[PDB]
Amino acid sequence: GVATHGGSYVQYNVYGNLFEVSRKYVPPLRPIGRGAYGIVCAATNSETGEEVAIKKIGNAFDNIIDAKRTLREIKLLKHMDHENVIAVKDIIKPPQRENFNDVYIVYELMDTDLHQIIRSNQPLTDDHCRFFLYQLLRGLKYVHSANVLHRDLKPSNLLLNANCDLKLGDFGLARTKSETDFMTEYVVTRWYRAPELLLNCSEYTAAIDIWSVGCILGETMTREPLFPGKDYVHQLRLITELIGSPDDSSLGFLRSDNARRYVRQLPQYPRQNFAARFPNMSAGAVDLLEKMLVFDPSRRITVDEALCHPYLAPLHDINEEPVCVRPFNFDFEQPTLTEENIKELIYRETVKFNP
Amino acid sequence: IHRDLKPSNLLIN
Ligand SMILES: Nc1ncnc2c1ncn2[C@@H]1O[C@H](COP(=O)(O)OP(=O)(O)NP(=O)(O)O)[C@@H](O)[C@H]1O
Ligand SMILES: [Mg+2]
Protein backbone atom coordinates (compact mmCIF):
# COMPACT_ATOMS: atom_id res chain seq x y z
CA GLY A 1 0.00 0.00 0.00
CA VAL A 2 0.82 3.57 -0.77
CA ALA A 3 -1.19 6.01 1.22
CA THR A 4 -2.60 8.88 -0.76
CA HIS A 5 -4.84 11.94 -0.44
CA GLY A 6 -3.23 12.76 2.89
CA GLY A 7 -3.32 9.19 4.20
CA SER A 8 -7.12 8.97 4.04
CA TYR A 9 -6.92 6.39 1.24
CA VAL A 10 -4.46 3.67 0.32
CA GLN A 11 -3.78 2.05 -3.04
CA TYR A 12 -3.06 -1.66 -3.24
CA ASN A 13 -1.74 -3.56 -6.24
CA VAL A 14 -3.82 -6.71 -6.80
CA TYR A 15 -2.39 -8.62 -9.80
CA GLY A 16 -1.85 -5.36 -11.67
CA ASN A 17 -5.21 -3.80 -10.81
CA LEU A 18 -4.96 -0.83 -8.46
CA PHE A 19 -7.49 -0.82 -5.64
CA GLU A 20 -7.79 2.61 -4.01
CA VAL A 21 -9.84 2.20 -0.83
CA SER A 22 -10.31 3.97 2.49
CA ARG A 23 -7.64 3.41 5.10
CA LYS A 24 -9.58 1.02 7.34
CA TYR A 25 -9.41 -1.70 4.65
CA VAL A 26 -6.14 -3.62 5.02
CA PRO A 27 -4.59 -6.85 3.65
CA PRO A 28 -4.42 -9.86 3.26
CA LEU A 29 -6.02 -9.16 -0.13
CA ARG A 30 -7.37 -12.27 -1.84
CA PRO A 31 -8.73 -12.16 -5.43
CA ILE A 32 -12.01 -14.08 -5.25
CA GLY A 33 -13.68 -13.37 -8.57
CA ARG A 34 -13.89 -11.39 -11.80
CA GLY A 35 -17.03 -10.71 -13.81
CA ALA A 36 -17.96 -8.59 -16.80
CA TYR A 37 -18.05 -5.41 -14.72
CA GLY A 38 -16.47 -5.97 -11.30
CA ILE A 39 -13.15 -7.25 -10.03
CA VAL A 40 -13.70 -8.61 -6.53
CA CYS A 41 -11.18 -8.88 -3.73
CA ALA A 42 -11.49 -10.02 -0.12
CA ALA A 43 -9.94 -7.74 2.51
CA THR A 44 -10.10 -6.96 6.22
CA ASN A 45 -11.98 -4.12 7.88
CA SER A 46 -9.50 -3.22 10.63
CA GLU A 47 -12.00 -1.02 12.45
CA THR A 48 -14.42 -3.92 12.96
CA GLY A 49 -12.16 -6.96 12.66
CA GLU A 50 -14.19 -8.44 9.76
CA GLU A 51 -13.36 -9.94 6.40
CA VAL A 52 -15.24 -8.27 3.52
CA ALA A 53 -15.57 -8.55 -0.26
CA ILE A 54 -14.59 -5.34 -2.08
CA LYS A 55 -15.84 -5.17 -5.67
CA LYS A 56 -14.09 -2.61 -7.87
CA ILE A 57 -16.22 -1.42 -10.79
CA GLY A 58 -13.85 0.37 -13.15
CA ASN A 59 -15.14 3.22 -15.32
CA ALA A 60 -18.62 2.94 -13.88
CA PHE A 61 -19.93 6.17 -15.42
CA ASP A 62 -18.64 5.94 -18.99
CA ASN A 63 -22.11 5.50 -20.53
CA ILE A 64 -25.72 5.52 -19.36
CA ILE A 65 -26.12 1.72 -19.48
CA ASP A 66 -23.16 0.97 -17.20
CA ALA A 67 -24.23 3.79 -14.87
CA LYS A 68 -27.75 2.41 -14.48
CA ARG A 69 -26.55 -1.14 -13.73
CA THR A 70 -24.33 0.22 -10.95
CA LEU A 71 -27.28 2.25 -9.67
CA ARG A 72 -29.60 -0.80 -9.68
CA GLU A 73 -27.09 -2.99 -7.89
CA ILE A 74 -26.74 -0.45 -5.11
CA LYS A 75 -30.39 0.57 -4.69
CA LEU A 76 -31.85 -2.93 -4.89
CA LEU A 77 -29.32 -4.34 -2.42
CA LYS A 78 -29.82 -1.50 0.06
CA HIS A 79 -33.56 -2.15 -0.30
CA MET A 80 -33.53 -5.91 0.34
CA ASP A 81 -33.15 -7.23 3.88
CA HIS A 82 -33.26 -11.02 3.69
CA GLU A 83 -31.13 -13.98 4.75
CA ASN A 84 -30.88 -15.20 1.13
CA VAL A 85 -29.90 -11.83 -0.41
CA ILE A 86 -26.34 -10.51 -0.19
CA ALA A 87 -25.97 -7.41 2.00
CA VAL A 88 -24.00 -4.27 1.19
CA LYS A 89 -21.67 -3.27 4.02
CA ASP A 90 -20.16 -0.05 2.60
CA ILE A 91 -19.76 2.04 -0.53
CA ILE A 92 -16.42 3.80 -0.61
CA LYS A 93 -16.58 7.57 -0.89
CA PRO A 94 -14.42 8.73 -3.83
CA PRO A 95 -11.55 10.88 -2.55
CA GLN A 96 -12.76 13.85 -4.61
CA ARG A 97 -16.23 14.20 -6.10
CA GLU A 98 -14.69 15.91 -9.14
CA ASN A 99 -12.79 12.74 -10.18
CA PHE A 100 -15.31 9.96 -9.52
CA ASN A 101 -14.75 7.15 -12.03
CA ASP A 102 -14.42 3.88 -10.07
CA VAL A 103 -17.09 2.57 -7.69
CA TYR A 104 -16.06 0.26 -4.82
CA ILE A 105 -18.90 -1.72 -3.24
CA VAL A 106 -18.08 -3.57 -0.03
CA TYR A 107 -20.16 -6.70 0.52
CA GLU A 108 -20.41 -9.31 3.19
CA LEU A 109 -17.84 -12.00 2.34
CA MET A 110 -18.98 -15.49 1.20
CA ASP A 111 -16.75 -18.55 0.85
CA THR A 112 -17.41 -19.32 -2.84
CA ASP A 113 -20.24 -19.52 -5.39
CA LEU A 114 -22.39 -22.30 -6.81
CA HIS A 115 -20.53 -22.41 -10.13
CA GLN A 116 -17.26 -23.25 -8.38
CA ILE A 117 -19.01 -25.87 -6.26
CA ILE A 118 -20.68 -27.55 -9.25
CA ARG A 119 -17.27 -27.81 -11.02
CA SER A 120 -15.42 -29.02 -7.92
CA ASN A 121 -14.20 -32.56 -7.20
CA GLN A 122 -16.70 -33.35 -4.43
CA PRO A 123 -20.20 -34.91 -4.19
CA LEU A 124 -23.39 -32.89 -4.55
CA THR A 125 -26.01 -35.06 -2.84
CA ASP A 126 -29.77 -34.82 -3.13
CA ASP A 127 -29.76 -32.87 0.12
CA HIS A 128 -27.33 -30.28 -1.30
CA CYS A 129 -29.53 -29.77 -4.38
CA ARG A 130 -32.67 -29.52 -2.27
CA PHE A 131 -31.05 -27.14 0.20
CA PHE A 132 -29.60 -24.87 -2.51
CA LEU A 133 -32.89 -24.85 -4.42
CA TYR A 134 -34.98 -24.09 -1.36
CA GLN A 135 -32.89 -21.05 -0.42
CA LEU A 136 -32.83 -19.82 -4.00
CA LEU A 137 -36.64 -20.00 -4.19
CA ARG A 138 -36.95 -18.47 -0.72
CA GLY A 139 -34.91 -15.44 -1.71
CA LEU A 140 -36.71 -15.13 -5.03
CA LYS A 141 -40.06 -15.13 -3.22
CA TYR A 142 -38.91 -12.07 -1.28
CA VAL A 143 -37.33 -10.34 -4.29
CA HIS A 144 -40.42 -10.87 -6.47
CA SER A 145 -42.72 -9.66 -3.66
CA ALA A 146 -40.75 -6.38 -3.71
CA ASN A 147 -41.90 -6.17 -7.38
CA VAL A 148 -38.42 -7.00 -8.75
CA LEU A 149 -37.35 -9.61 -11.33
CA HIS A 150 -33.71 -10.63 -10.97
CA ARG A 151 -33.39 -11.53 -14.68
CA ASP A 152 -29.82 -12.85 -14.55
CA LEU A 153 -29.76 -15.89 -12.29
CA LYS A 154 -26.79 -18.22 -12.84
CA PRO A 155 -24.65 -20.45 -10.60
CA SER A 156 -21.89 -17.85 -10.36
CA ASN A 157 -24.35 -15.27 -8.85
CA LEU A 158 -25.42 -17.66 -6.06
CA LEU A 159 -22.94 -17.01 -3.27
CA LEU A 160 -22.31 -19.85 -0.83
CA ASN A 161 -20.67 -20.58 2.49
CA ALA A 162 -19.25 -23.95 3.49
CA ASN A 163 -22.28 -24.59 5.73
CA CYS A 164 -24.33 -24.36 2.45
CA ASP A 165 -25.94 -20.95 3.21
CA LEU A 166 -26.83 -19.36 -0.11
CA LYS A 167 -27.25 -15.69 -1.06
CA LEU A 168 -28.45 -14.18 -4.31
CA GLY A 169 -26.14 -11.49 -5.62
CA ASP A 170 -25.54 -9.38 -8.75
CA PHE A 171 -28.78 -7.37 -9.14
CA GLY A 172 -27.50 -4.99 -11.83
CA LEU A 173 -29.73 -6.44 -14.57
CA ALA A 174 -32.86 -6.63 -12.44
CA ARG A 175 -36.10 -4.91 -13.46
CA THR A 176 -39.23 -3.88 -11.63
CA LYS A 177 -42.27 -5.82 -12.81
CA SER A 178 -43.47 -2.56 -14.34
CA GLU A 179 -40.48 -1.54 -16.49
CA THR A 180 -40.48 -4.66 -18.60
CA ASP A 181 -38.46 -3.64 -21.64
CA PHE A 182 -37.25 -5.62 -24.73
CA MET A 183 -33.52 -4.82 -24.55
CA THR A 184 -31.38 -7.53 -23.00
CA GLU A 185 -27.95 -6.42 -21.78
CA TYR A 186 -24.95 -8.45 -22.85
CA VAL A 187 -24.07 -11.24 -20.47
CA VAL A 188 -21.21 -13.64 -21.00
CA THR A 189 -23.85 -16.31 -20.21
CA ARG A 190 -26.88 -16.76 -22.46
CA TRP A 191 -27.04 -20.31 -21.08
CA TYR A 192 -29.62 -19.43 -18.37
CA ARG A 193 -31.89 -17.12 -20.43
CA ALA A 194 -35.55 -18.04 -20.82
CA PRO A 195 -36.92 -18.37 -24.37
CA GLU A 196 -38.85 -15.07 -23.98
CA LEU A 197 -35.47 -13.36 -23.62
CA LEU A 198 -33.79 -15.32 -26.44
CA LEU A 199 -36.65 -14.24 -28.71
CA ASN A 200 -36.67 -10.57 -27.54
CA CYS A 201 -40.15 -10.55 -26.04
CA SER A 202 -40.91 -7.09 -24.65
CA GLU A 203 -43.56 -8.23 -22.16
CA TYR A 204 -42.48 -10.96 -19.76
CA THR A 205 -42.98 -11.99 -16.16
CA ALA A 206 -41.44 -13.73 -13.16
CA ALA A 207 -41.44 -16.84 -15.35
CA ILE A 208 -38.01 -15.84 -16.73
CA ASP A 209 -36.44 -16.26 -13.28
CA ILE A 210 -38.09 -19.66 -12.88
CA TRP A 211 -36.52 -20.79 -16.18
CA SER A 212 -33.07 -19.87 -14.82
CA VAL A 213 -33.88 -21.75 -11.61
CA GLY A 214 -34.58 -24.88 -13.65
CA CYS A 215 -31.32 -24.52 -15.57
CA ILE A 216 -29.53 -24.19 -12.25
CA LEU A 217 -31.28 -27.14 -10.60
CA GLY A 218 -30.55 -29.33 -13.62
CA GLU A 219 -26.89 -28.29 -13.54
CA THR A 220 -26.63 -29.18 -9.83
CA MET A 221 -27.94 -32.71 -10.63
CA THR A 222 -25.91 -33.35 -13.83
CA ARG A 223 -22.86 -31.19 -12.96
CA GLU A 224 -22.97 -29.77 -16.56
CA PRO A 225 -24.86 -26.79 -18.00
CA LEU A 226 -28.02 -28.06 -19.65
CA PHE A 227 -28.05 -25.64 -22.61
CA PRO A 228 -24.46 -24.32 -23.41
CA GLY A 229 -25.27 -22.89 -26.82
CA LYS A 230 -22.27 -21.53 -28.65
CA ASP A 231 -24.61 -18.84 -30.02
CA TYR A 232 -28.29 -17.95 -29.69
CA VAL A 233 -29.51 -20.26 -32.47
CA HIS A 234 -27.61 -23.21 -31.01
CA GLN A 235 -29.07 -22.31 -27.62
CA LEU A 236 -32.69 -22.52 -28.78
CA ARG A 237 -31.91 -25.83 -30.50
CA LEU A 238 -30.39 -27.39 -27.36
CA ILE A 239 -33.51 -26.34 -25.47
CA THR A 240 -35.87 -27.98 -27.95
CA GLU A 241 -33.61 -31.05 -28.14
CA LEU A 242 -34.45 -31.64 -24.46
CA ILE A 243 -38.07 -30.52 -24.08
CA GLY A 244 -39.27 -30.85 -27.66
CA SER A 245 -40.20 -28.32 -30.27
CA PRO A 246 -42.99 -25.96 -29.20
CA ASP A 247 -46.44 -26.49 -30.71
CA ASP A 248 -48.52 -23.52 -31.89
CA SER A 249 -50.17 -22.95 -28.50
CA SER A 250 -46.74 -22.86 -26.85
CA LEU A 251 -45.68 -20.15 -29.32
CA GLY A 252 -48.66 -17.95 -28.49
CA PHE A 253 -46.57 -15.42 -26.57
CA LEU A 254 -44.50 -14.52 -29.64
CA ARG A 255 -45.33 -11.19 -31.24
CA SER A 256 -43.99 -11.51 -34.78
CA ASP A 257 -44.01 -13.92 -37.68
CA ASN A 258 -40.24 -13.21 -37.81
CA ALA A 259 -39.72 -14.78 -34.40
CA ARG A 260 -42.18 -17.54 -35.32
CA ARG A 261 -40.30 -18.52 -38.47
CA TYR A 262 -37.01 -18.32 -36.54
CA VAL A 263 -38.20 -21.05 -34.14
CA ARG A 264 -39.80 -23.24 -36.83
CA GLN A 265 -36.76 -23.13 -39.12
CA LEU A 266 -35.00 -25.13 -36.39
CA PRO A 267 -35.04 -28.92 -36.73
CA GLN A 268 -38.16 -30.23 -35.04
CA TYR A 269 -37.70 -32.55 -32.09
CA PRO A 270 -39.99 -34.65 -29.88
CA ARG A 271 -40.42 -33.83 -26.22
CA GLN A 272 -38.04 -36.15 -24.39
CA ASN A 273 -39.07 -38.15 -21.36
CA PHE A 274 -37.26 -36.47 -18.48
CA ALA A 275 -36.92 -39.70 -16.50
CA ALA A 276 -35.07 -41.26 -19.45
CA ARG A 277 -32.70 -38.30 -19.80
CA PHE A 278 -32.14 -38.04 -16.02
CA PRO A 279 -32.16 -41.61 -14.68
CA ASN A 280 -30.99 -42.65 -11.22
CA MET A 281 -31.95 -39.24 -9.80
CA SER A 282 -34.59 -38.06 -7.37
CA ALA A 283 -38.11 -38.42 -8.78
CA GLY A 284 -39.22 -35.28 -6.94
CA ALA A 285 -36.29 -33.38 -8.45
CA VAL A 286 -36.90 -34.52 -12.04
CA ASP A 287 -40.59 -33.77 -11.65
CA LEU A 288 -39.87 -30.21 -10.51
CA LEU A 289 -37.23 -29.69 -13.21
CA GLU A 290 -39.78 -30.66 -15.87
CA LYS A 291 -42.30 -28.16 -14.50
CA MET A 292 -39.77 -25.28 -14.62
CA LEU A 293 -38.29 -26.03 -18.07
CA VAL A 294 -41.51 -25.42 -19.96
CA PHE A 295 -41.17 -23.44 -23.20
CA ASP A 296 -44.47 -21.55 -22.77
CA PRO A 297 -43.91 -19.20 -19.78
CA SER A 298 -47.59 -19.06 -18.94
CA ARG A 299 -47.34 -22.78 -18.23
CA ARG A 300 -44.23 -22.68 -15.99
CA ILE A 301 -44.61 -23.37 -12.30
CA THR A 302 -44.30 -20.24 -10.16
CA VAL A 303 -41.94 -19.59 -7.24
CA ASP A 304 -44.75 -20.09 -4.72
CA GLU A 305 -45.93 -23.36 -6.27
CA ALA A 306 -42.33 -24.60 -6.39
CA LEU A 307 -41.95 -23.96 -2.65
CA CYS A 308 -44.95 -26.27 -2.11
CA HIS A 309 -43.59 -28.98 -4.42
CA PRO A 310 -43.00 -32.38 -2.70
CA TYR A 311 -39.27 -32.20 -3.43
CA LEU A 312 -39.07 -29.23 -1.02
CA ALA A 313 -41.58 -30.46 1.58
CA PRO A 314 -38.69 -31.37 3.97
CA LEU A 315 -37.69 -27.68 4.08
CA HIS A 316 -40.93 -25.83 3.32
CA ASP A 317 -42.38 -23.74 6.16
CA ILE A 318 -44.55 -20.66 5.55
CA ASN A 319 -43.47 -19.31 8.93
CA GLU A 320 -39.90 -18.92 7.58
CA GLU A 321 -40.67 -17.49 4.11
CA PRO A 322 -41.20 -13.76 4.51
CA VAL A 323 -42.28 -11.39 1.80
CA CYS A 324 -41.10 -7.82 1.35
CA VAL A 325 -43.74 -5.51 2.82
CA ARG A 326 -41.97 -2.46 1.35
CA PRO A 327 -42.19 -2.37 -2.48
CA PHE A 328 -39.32 -1.01 -4.52
CA ASN A 329 -40.41 2.22 -6.22
CA PHE A 330 -37.32 3.86 -7.72
CA ASP A 331 -37.71 4.44 -11.45
CA PHE A 332 -34.44 3.85 -13.33
CA GLU A 333 -36.13 4.99 -16.60
CA GLN A 334 -36.84 8.64 -15.83
CA PRO A 335 -35.79 10.63 -18.93
CA THR A 336 -33.80 13.12 -16.84
CA LEU A 337 -31.27 10.41 -15.86
CA THR A 338 -27.73 11.07 -17.15
CA GLU A 339 -24.34 9.59 -16.33
CA GLU A 340 -23.71 12.75 -14.32
CA ASN A 341 -26.77 12.74 -12.07
CA ILE A 342 -26.46 8.98 -11.61
CA LYS A 343 -22.93 9.76 -10.43
CA GLU A 344 -24.39 12.30 -7.98
CA LEU A 345 -26.96 9.81 -6.61
CA ILE A 346 -24.29 7.16 -6.06
CA TYR A 347 -21.96 9.73 -4.50
CA ARG A 348 -24.83 10.50 -2.14
CA GLU A 349 -25.25 6.86 -1.24
CA THR A 350 -21.54 6.80 -0.31
CA VAL A 351 -21.96 9.71 2.03
CA LYS A 352 -24.71 7.81 3.73
CA PHE A 353 -21.89 5.37 4.62
CA ASN A 354 -18.99 7.87 5.04
CA PRO A 355 -20.23 11.41 5.88
CA ILE B 1 -32.85 -27.02 10.72
CA HIS B 2 -33.37 -30.90 11.22
CA ARG B 3 -30.56 -33.44 11.26
CA ASP B 4 -32.73 -35.45 8.78
CA LEU B 5 -31.42 -33.29 5.91
CA LYS B 6 -28.56 -30.95 7.10
CA PRO B 7 -26.26 -31.36 4.12
CA SER B 8 -22.60 -31.98 4.79
CA ASN B 9 -20.31 -28.95 4.83
CA LEU B 10 -18.70 -28.12 1.49
CA LEU B 11 -15.00 -28.30 0.67
CA ILE B 12 -13.72 -24.90 -0.50
CA ASN B 13 -10.31 -23.81 -1.74
N1 LIG C 1 -19.72 -10.95 -1.54
C1 LIG C 1 -18.99 -11.89 -2.19
N2 LIG C 1 -18.35 -12.87 -1.52
C2 LIG C 1 -17.63 -13.81 -2.16
N3 LIG C 1 -17.48 -13.86 -3.50
C3 LIG C 1 -18.07 -12.94 -4.30
C4 LIG C 1 -18.88 -11.88 -3.67
N4 LIG C 1 -19.35 -11.11 -4.67
C5 LIG C 1 -18.88 -11.63 -5.84
N5 LIG C 1 -18.12 -12.72 -5.61
C6 LIG C 1 -17.45 -13.54 -6.66
O1 LIG C 1 -16.84 -12.68 -7.62
C7 LIG C 1 -17.37 -12.90 -8.93
C8 LIG C 1 -17.95 -11.60 -9.48
O2 LIG C 1 -19.26 -11.41 -8.95
P1 LIG C 1 -20.34 -10.52 -9.75
O3 LIG C 1 -20.96 -9.55 -8.77
O4 LIG C 1 -21.22 -11.45 -10.54
O5 LIG C 1 -19.42 -9.69 -10.78
P2 LIG C 1 -20.09 -8.64 -11.80
O6 LIG C 1 -19.10 -8.44 -12.92
O7 LIG C 1 -20.50 -7.44 -10.99
N6 LIG C 1 -21.53 -9.37 -12.47
P3 LIG C 1 -21.41 -10.48 -13.82
O8 LIG C 1 -20.73 -9.68 -14.90
O9 LIG C 1 -22.84 -10.85 -14.14
O10 LIG C 1 -20.59 -11.63 -13.29
C9 LIG C 1 -18.43 -13.98 -8.83
O11 LIG C 1 -18.06 -15.10 -9.64
C10 LIG C 1 -18.48 -14.39 -7.38
O12 LIG C 1 -18.15 -15.78 -7.24
MG1 LIG D 1 -23.66 -5.71 -10.34
From Swiss-Prot, chain A:
Tree of life domain: Eukaryota
Compartments reported by the entry: Cytoplasm; Nucleus; Cytoplasm, Cytoskeleton
Keyword Secreted assigned: no
Pfam families listed in its UniProt record: Pkinase (PF00069)
Reaction equation(s) it catalyzes: L-seryl-[protein] + ATP = O-phospho-L-seryl-[protein] + ADP + H(+); L-threonyl-[protein] + ATP = O-phospho-L-threonyl-[protein] + ADP + H(+)
GO MF annotation terms: ATP binding; kinase activity; MAP kinase activity; protein kinase activity; protein serine kinase activity
Sequence positions bearing Phosphothreonine: T184
Motif (TXY): 184-186
Disrupted-gene phenotype: Dwarf plants with cytokinetic defects in leaf epidermal cells. Abnormally developed and branched root hairs. Retarded root growth with the protrusion of many epidermal cells from roots. Heavily bundled and disoriented cortical microtubules resistant to oryzalin. Exhibits a seedling-lethality phenotype. Defects in the formation of the cell plate. Abnormal mature pollen grains. Abolished CO(2)-mediated stomatal closure.
Family annotation (CDD domains): STKc_TEY_MAPK (cd07858)
Residue numbers bearing the Phosphotyrosine modification: Y186
Record: residues binding ATP: I32, G33, R34, G35, A36, Y37, G38, I39, V40, K55
Top EC category: transferase
Regulation: Activated by threonine and tyrosine phosphorylation. Activated by the MAP kinase kinases MKK1 and MKK2. Activated in response to touch, wounding, low temperature, low humidity, salt stress and the bacterial elicitors flagellin and harpin. Activated upon Pseudomonas syringae pv. tomato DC3000 infection. Repressed by the protein phosphatase 2C AP2C1. Repressed by DSPTP1-mediated dephosphorylation. Activated by the MAP kinase kinase MKK6 in vitro.
Major site of localization recorded for this protein: cytoplasm
Domain Protein kinase: 26-312
Residues annotated as the enzyme's active site: D152
The protein, known as: Mitogen-activated protein kinase 4
Organism this protein belongs to: Arabidopsis thaliana
From Swiss-Prot, chain B:
Tissue and organ expression note: Expressed in roots, stem, flowers and siliques.
Effect of disrupting the coding gene: No obvious developmental defects under normal growth conditions. Compromised in resistance to both virulent and avirulent Pseudomonas syringae strains. Reduced sensitivity to abscisic acid (ABA) during germination and reduced drought tolerance of seedlings. Simultaneous knockdown of MKK1 and MKK2 results in dwarf and small plants exhibiting a seedling-lethality phenotype.
Residues at the active site: D4 (proton acceptor)
Top-level division of the source organism's lineage: Eukaryota
Induction context: By wounding.
Similarity comment text for this entry: Belongs to the protein kinase superfamily. STE Ser/Thr protein kinase family. MAP kinase kinase subfamily.
Quaternary assembly: Interacts with MEKK1 and MPK4. May form a ternary complex composed of MEKK1 and MKK1/MKK2 and MPK4. Interacts with P.syringae type III effector HopF2. Interacts with MPK11.
Function: MEKK1, MKK1/MKK2 and MPK4/MPK6 function in a signaling pathway that modulates the expression of genes responding to biotic and abiotic stresses and also plays an important role in pathogen defense by negatively regulating innate immunity. Activates by phosphorylation the downstream MPK4. Acts redundantly with MKK2. MKK1-MPK6 module mediates abscisic acid (ABA)-dependent CAT1 expression with H(2)O(2) production and response to drought and salt stress. MKK1-MPK6 module is also involved in sugar signaling during the process of seed germination.
Record-given protein name: Mitogen-activated protein kinase kinase 1
Source species: Arabidopsis thaliana
Gene responsible for this protein: MKK1
Residues of the full protein shown: 187 to 199 of 354
